[PDB]
Amino acid sequence: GPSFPEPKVVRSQGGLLSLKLSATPTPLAIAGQRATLLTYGGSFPGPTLRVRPRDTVRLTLENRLPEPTNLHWHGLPISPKVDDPFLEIPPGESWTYEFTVPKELAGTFWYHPHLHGRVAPQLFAGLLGALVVESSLDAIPELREAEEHLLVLKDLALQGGRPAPHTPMDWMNGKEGDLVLVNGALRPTLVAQKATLRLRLLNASNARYYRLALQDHPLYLIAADGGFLEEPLEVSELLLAPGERAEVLVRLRKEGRFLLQALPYDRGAMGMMDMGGMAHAMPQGPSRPETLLYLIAPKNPKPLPLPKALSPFPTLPAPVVTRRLVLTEDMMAARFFINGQVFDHRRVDLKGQAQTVEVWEVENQGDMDHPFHLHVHPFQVLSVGGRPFPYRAWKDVVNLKAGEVARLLVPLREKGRTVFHCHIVEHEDRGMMGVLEVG
Ligand SMILES: [Cu+2]
Ligand SMILES: [Cu+2]
Ligand SMILES: [Cu+2]
């Protein structure tokens, strides 16, 4: 096959993407070994669904797992009557998700389980895939002539040829694995044929962070989680927290081999030590550096000019309400809270009005990073930690380091009951989630 492994793509046909997937235990070859993973469509990652605005998606999920499951269409601004976080598909049963792709939408999205209490083990075991919304913007020469690839960043740990079980410490920290993979492959080689690459990046890990840096090169950020920036933004590195997506252009500067690395990053994970008094909690510190892939540049590379502009960001109405949400931890109990409470599916926490805009101030009073996610209603990050955000784009996950406040502009779109939660999915399973009702 191609030197660079990417998931199989399924495209809409005549404006319709009609597909049956089964969530199933699946024997595979993974990183040179044989293992049984939980997969959609018999692959890890699952197939990439590629659609255009106004397409109809009709996806029948058959549950062939021994436990209930469901889907979350992460990042899609569709109705929570479709993207229903409370729905349970029992073992052996099927459910059809049907929705229309919104008109004003572009970018990289993804699908994964969201059955409360069961997300972390199901996602860890391999249940994920990408969804790409194509854009008329993809036709501009500076993007059309770039070489495009999807990078699904997901780590894994295996024990006895199956995903490693969660330990108590894993429920506290979020589980990370020693196999740090791209598209389910261990350190693949990308032999570029063009001097400009357009990389769509997805962090589909439970808890691992990727502080991305390409040796000797900057990255040009052109999209965040849920849409394009207004113009490319040059960055030296790019942190991708769990659940986040980005698209970057890479302009290869000379012939050679360049490592794409996940550089050391301390997200505040904890360990335990006993030094004669003790036992107490002690910081794990930064992650060890990882090589993600080897990027080979072509001969005499002459990158395309960057796009001068991408997509203008919508002018939003003045906001009608300010919310303040506070995240806290009880680490030794592996319990996690929003405004002092754990999730209760019967309890509505926030009530808002459709087609109004809210300001959400999300404050991390814990010591760990927490990547905050809101379903259904993409937001504009205004500032984090008191620093203004350097671009305007739609996001649906925002990382908060210890002590930081994120200020979000949140237009409320579809009516109904939905959720917001930490996307370290162990923390969501352990209570860090709340309910928003839009009417
Ligand atoms: Cu998600
Ligand atoms: Cu968290
Ligand atoms: Cu969710």
Ligand SMILES: [O-]
């Ligand atoms: O989620």
